[PDB]
Every structure is written in structure tokens, then in C-alpha cells.
Symmetry: C3
Subunit: 143 residues, 3 copies
């Protein structure tokens, strides 16, 4: 089999209104050294990791105020407490009561070091939608 | 060199209003045990697989009934038949139907799904949409589904 | 420490109005044979590669006319001069007002030595690389 560090976590459906990564669920992974601490994935050993995450935002009708939805995956190494954005995207659901949906997918390969902490964050958890499985996830795999 | 289960299938360009995955063509893959059956990719052996898919939807203007577009990759395992959604996303191309006496402009909405999953031999993977009437595969590279054992 | 051909390049925030890929930067990669030439990633050896790219488009206001935003990864082989689109997507932007439209592309492909991969857009005037992590292009031999 494989002993490569791997994780695939999803939004916890019991933490409504928040983004709390969860691995205790069917079709989720957290193994071979990867840990979930303080809502962040912690890298076991150095190497090339494919990192990815998807969030789905939804709302009914368009707010009177212009809203921007952001999703970013950031890296925090032990050699610097300053978070660095590896992947980031923005979306504007409204131009100015029909429900809107906006998915954001981020993904790339990065050289990581042992102890590195990866965070997958959003700016509007009040719009996050994990009403159904597979809509919000965050993962990594050492290649 | 190879040996690892792999597939990269694409929408049949000749299909009409249906998402038919195909592999026998340039820049598409289906090898090392992966099979294409009943429009599903069948896993030959257990392991961690990267699974991904993209669909592109397009329409001419905004209709009366509000449209939600969905794309979902699901897994069927023999020992727990109940199909389960591994990855799924939804998009809304319009906020209101094209005004009366207004110009009906075409819209395009891509959806990309991708993740790493532990699969077992015999597992069947589906990548399906709810609105094949808006699926757009007019040009190459717009609709694809693939997996690779890592 | 790895041995597999790999690259992760990003938009040069200093080349305005243009999409110029750059590897010389923290959290970017270009090793084990992969090279950047004429703004394209050049494949070192035959094999399966995961290839992907993301672009972000933005405008302070919605276009006065109907516009289509495109992002495509194409392949140019040494045996086929005409480019082939491996991955492609299209987005229709809107017709207190700034808009953003991300596009992500990715898939696994059998490539050959010398193959050239290009990740391009149709509207560099709308490309947004104001912040890190928004525009990238990468490949890795699996």
C-alpha cells in the first residue's frame, strides 16, 4: 500500500455557521503522519505536497451591500510565524430573492517542511454552505 | 513507467444533451485496470486516488425558472451500495430572467472538483450533472473526468 | 530533495497588462528537468503528469458589453506544430461594483520530452495578480 502523508478533511456539518475541518467521517482521511490541530493540517515531513481545497458559498437574494467572498490556503513554518498565502481566490456573488451559489477551488504543488501548518480559510462563514456532502473540503498528499 | 491505474476521459463531442464519457482518443487515458462501464470509472485495486472532474455549462440568456447547475462525483462500493457524494458544487448563472425587450447574452459556468480518496477494487465512480441540457462540450478540454492512483 | 520533474510558477506582478510566468520566487518551483521557455513549461521526459493552473480576473466595474473570459492549457508537441487544448474553461462576467472571476484547470496527461505547455488567457487587461496565490501554473510527473 501507501505510507505517504495524506489528509482530506471536510466541513463539520455540526458546526453550522462556522468552518471547522473534520476527519471523523466516511470518505475523509488523516493519516501517515498528518495531524489536524487548531483547525490546521500539520505536515509530518519535508517533500512535495499537492494541496487543495474547495468551499461553496450560498445566499438567498443579493445583499444591499456589495460582498466579496475569499478563500485562501496559507502556510506557517516553524522558521517564521508569518502566514504566507500559497493559493487564493476571490468571487463577487452580486453585481448590485433568488438563491445564488459560488464555488471556489484552489490547488497546487508545494515544497513543505516538517512542522509546517496549512490553513484553508474563508472571510464569510455566514455564507458557507455544507448543507450536502462534498461541498467543502481541504486536503494534501505527499507526492 | 505507468502500471498505476489511471483514467482521463472526456465528454463525447457528438453527444446531444447527454454527458457520455469517452477515452478512445488523443489526450485521453484509460489504463492499468481502470474500466469505463455504464458511464462510470471502475477502480481495479485499493489505494489512494486523486479524483477530479470539470464540466462547463452555457446558455443563451436567463430563463424564467431560476437555474441551479450542479456537478457531483459519487462513489458506489459493493459492501455499502448506498451511493455517496465525494465531491459536489453548485453554480447560479442568473439572478433574474432576461428582461423583456432586453438583450439575451450567453453565459458560461465552469465547475471543477478534485480530491484524494481511499478506494477499493470494484468501486464505481460517477461524475454527473443535473442539467445536461446546458452542458457545453462544443470545444475540447471543457468537460473531463479523471483518476490516478498515487 | 525530490527527484520527479516539477514546476509551480506564478504571475509576475511586475508585468502589468501581461501574463508572464515566474519561478524565481518563494513557494514556486521549477526543477528536475522542467524548464520555462517563451513563457511555456517544457516537459523533460515521457510519462504521466498532473498539470493545473488558476487565473483570477477582476474589473472595478462590469464591462459595458458582453465579454467572455477564457483560460486554457494547451500542448505543443515536437511532432505537431498546431496547439491542442488539453484543458479549457470560459466564464461570462457581469453585464460596491468591483467583480472577481477565478478559473481553475487541472488534469492528468501522458506527455513527451520536449512537449511545450502553455497556460493562457484572452483578456490580460482583466488579469488580477494584485496579491500572491491568485495566478499560477504547475505540473508534476507522477
Amino acid at each position: 500500500p501507501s505510507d505517504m502523508p495524506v489528509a482530506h478533511v471536510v466541513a463539520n456539518p455540526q458546526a453550522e455557521g462556522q468552518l471547522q475541518w473534520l476527519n471523523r467521517r466516511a470518505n475523509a482521511l488523516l493519516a501517515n503522519g498528518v495531524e489536524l490541530r487548531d483547525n490546521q493540517l500539520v505536515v509530518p515531513s519535508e517533500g512535495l505536497y499537492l494541496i487543495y481545497s474547495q468551499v461553496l458559498f450560498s445566499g438567498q437574494g443579493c445583499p444591499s451591500t456589495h460582498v466579496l467572498l475569499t478563500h485562501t490556503i496559507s502556510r506557517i513554518s516553524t522558521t517564521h510565524n508569518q502566514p504566507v498565502n500559497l493559493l487564493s481566490a476571490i468571487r463577487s456573488p452580486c453585481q448590485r430573492a433568488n438563491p445564488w451559489y459560488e464555488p471556489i477551488y484552489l490547488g497546487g504543488v508545494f515544497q513543505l517542511e516538517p512542522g509546517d501548518r496549512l490553513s484553508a480559510e474563508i472571510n464569510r462563514p455566514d455564507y458557507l454552505d455544507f448543507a450536502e456532502s462534498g461541498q467543502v473540503y481541504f486536503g494534501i498528499i505527499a507526492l
